[PDB]
User: Fold this.
Amino acid sequence: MVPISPIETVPVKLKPGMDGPKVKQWPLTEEKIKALVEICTEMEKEGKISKIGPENPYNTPVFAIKKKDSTKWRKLVDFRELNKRTQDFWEVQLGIPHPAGLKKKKSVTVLDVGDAYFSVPLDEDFRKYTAFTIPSINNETPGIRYQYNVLPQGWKGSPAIFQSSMTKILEPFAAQNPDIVIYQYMDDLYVGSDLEIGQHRTKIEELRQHLLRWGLTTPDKKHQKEPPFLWMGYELHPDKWTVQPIVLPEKDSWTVNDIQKLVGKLNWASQIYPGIKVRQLSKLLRGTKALTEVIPLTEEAELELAENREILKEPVHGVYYDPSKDLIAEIQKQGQGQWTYQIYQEPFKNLKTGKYARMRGAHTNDVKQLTEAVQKITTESIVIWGKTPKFKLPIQKETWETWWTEYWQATWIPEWEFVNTPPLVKLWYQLEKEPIVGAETFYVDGAANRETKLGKAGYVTNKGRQKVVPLTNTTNQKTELQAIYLALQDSGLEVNIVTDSQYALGIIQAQPDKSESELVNQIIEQLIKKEKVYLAWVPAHKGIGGNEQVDKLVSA
Amino acid sequence: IETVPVKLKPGMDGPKVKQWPLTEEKIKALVEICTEMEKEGKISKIGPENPYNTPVFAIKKKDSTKWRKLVDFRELNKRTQDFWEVQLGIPHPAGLKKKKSVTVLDVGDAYFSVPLDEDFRKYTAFTIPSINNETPGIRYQYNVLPQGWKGSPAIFQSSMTKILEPFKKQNPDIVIYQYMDDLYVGSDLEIGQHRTKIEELRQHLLRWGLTEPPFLWMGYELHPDKWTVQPIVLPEKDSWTVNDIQKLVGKLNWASQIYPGIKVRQLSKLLRGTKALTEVIPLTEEAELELAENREILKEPVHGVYYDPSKDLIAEIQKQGQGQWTYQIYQEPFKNLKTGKYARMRGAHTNDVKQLTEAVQKITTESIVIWGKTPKFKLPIQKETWETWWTEYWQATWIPEWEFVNTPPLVKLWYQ
Ligand SMILES: N#Cc1cc(Cl)cc(Oc2c(Br)ccc(CC(=O)Nc3ccc(S(N)(=O)=O)cc3Cl)c2F)c1
Assistant:
């Protein structure tokens, strides 16, 4: 006997007040019970479970399931109840590594410690709670009772307790081997080094020895799975990575769950396959969860797909990260609130790619959207590489400067450069800071009758120009915008406009370049054509005249 | 040597707050800092049986060049039992805000000499994250009282009292006040002397030091009688255009929500016609008196304005451009308890977010001195921009609460 170090146990407890489970054992066939009694004997003969007396009042049901064309049963304990009564554990597996974050190594070895999983003891005080019963044949003897001595499959704590225990064991090895990397992911170990493959299979051998100190062995026949490793929907190669094959269903009829599949799988592909678009397809999942409803495509969704399948036609690869080279992120405007980006270190070799969609809003602009996509890519990059990339952005230095200095919010983007790849993000209009000398002054007003939806919009100007248009199916807000629209329509290239509408100032002072309101868009389209607009606000109901000489004409 | 029984409130659990992403250099700083605190017993590794998390990050305090660990204990603080047991509180020193000068001292390291309840320790849990989730997070809990926890000053209060009495009875004009990791020292002196009285107050703490702290040698300088609330002021002109009078009526109408007998009828009278915005209007005699009257009214106090320690302080900030920022602190709209401006915001001449972040710190400091509590900010910024960047420019050991303004105020002007 060579003394193996024991794995220190993790103190466990049930929720505050909740007791253990008492679930009735399910009645089983004679065939099945025999199968369990054999397995539970082999398990007992290994140290994993133990027979208990009748005082233990705790029952977790047990089942036998047959492996597909294996005249051989396997044992399933339904812990779903004990889990609900078990305390919370810290979960670190929230996030998984991104392949573009990995630094390339000459040699990588994957070891699965498949045995070692049960090698980890359960908390002595907690075992009693894992009690299950093998019912006897014909129910004529009391069923054989068992408790676990090790972490069970299907238990709340096993993921977390397994990792804490593997980490604690690896600490000294990593510490005293700085020239290698070990990545722990659930039941697996991935081991990499930039060493000659002599010095490398040596260090791997040492790690098998070091794992033996805690009585753990790894495969002699060296793991059948060798490059490319197929992991969490990715493909890892010695020199590059990509996603596992993305094949898009060709079909005659496209249904609901068959678009809650086309989104997920197109989003997955978008991390390496540049310029995937999901907007016209996510448009269809709006509201209705009737999971078998054939929804017709749009004529925008058949040309967005003939783009998808031509991007998904030939494979593309991402490279791995080189900390000594610069990190670059480049953004393109795709249209309809859609943005696409590539992160790279060398021209044409992308670490990874992705997309950003416009946030749901009434009104928006391109510069706000670009700002949001920069922040998304900044955070993503902090997560994957521990740093902010230098940005290349389709916006002029002068445009950005005009924007941030005149914008009422605080805004910032990190270090970036202009890249001249149309279409360029630009400012479509700029409101004057002062009234314009020699430009006509339009005093505008609108109002609507709350009961009839009937209203009026118009203006009186300093030159005696006047208009009142009668409207139906309207509101105060709509009439206030229309008044402003009529002044814009009917004035020269320079114009002063006086409104009492706090609503219209709110929208125009947020500098939309695009709107869901067709009336706001028409205002935007006139603002684009003007040489100079000055918008002045005055309070309502002070008979500010032209706001009084036109509140009495539009409320008539 | 022996701890103090601490608990959470009624049916509230310990904090379970997601740790946010950190740059490689802030991860490196926290690994070196935490590895040393562990050797000195201040912290200990924990296992997965602890489900609690509080966020952690790394700053550089004002003028230093060495990283500091900051724990965002906002959530533990909300959930931490109120410490009223012996004393109904620290009845806020109303004197501190009247002093010519106030120096702010980081006495935070003091706390690390006093141990924490054994039961409570699990609630101080935090995680040093890894890049790309490559290794599991390095998990830690506090053994001693943590910087930034509300309980730390409350527990150390008795100890702080016994370290001060000598100086407080040596110098009875000095005002001394403790918020979080910070000591605030006010006087009615001239500076050279004030600076002396500070250096002396270090020789006390260095002497209780052995019975080299890293950030204990720093000193911040305020002037709270050289603070001013701001009157509303109207232009004085010889020539008024229609536009000038439209803006005056706008500001007077707004001011009318704060002040009683502000009248715009006679100035509105001037605006009746459809005149060109740049055309000069002679004021009528009724208009000139109404304006004179409104001025008189604005040179008085707001009526019925009082602090209420039961209610939230709310702080609003407007971006005025050219590095200038306006603010107001109230509890009831139109009842301002302080208003202010900032023009000079530090070495950030092309960075709006660094400027907002310094303004929030300065406003929070003022708020500590006046009412001994932090206000709820309304920031003129998108959440995602603010939450990406604030931690890059943050220098204080407390963190206030904030929300986001998404609609541009008309009012910006009325304070411009
Ligand atoms: N399964 C799996 C898996 C998952 C992760 Cl997140 C990492 C991993 O191993 C590594 C490690 Br550890 C470090 C770097 C990479 C990327 C890399 O350099 N890969 C690589 C490097 C070398 C070889 S070779 N020459 O041993 O066949 C094979 C491969 Cl896939 C890896 F793929 C393996």
Q: What stands out?
A: Chain B touches chain A through 66 residues (CB under 8 Å).
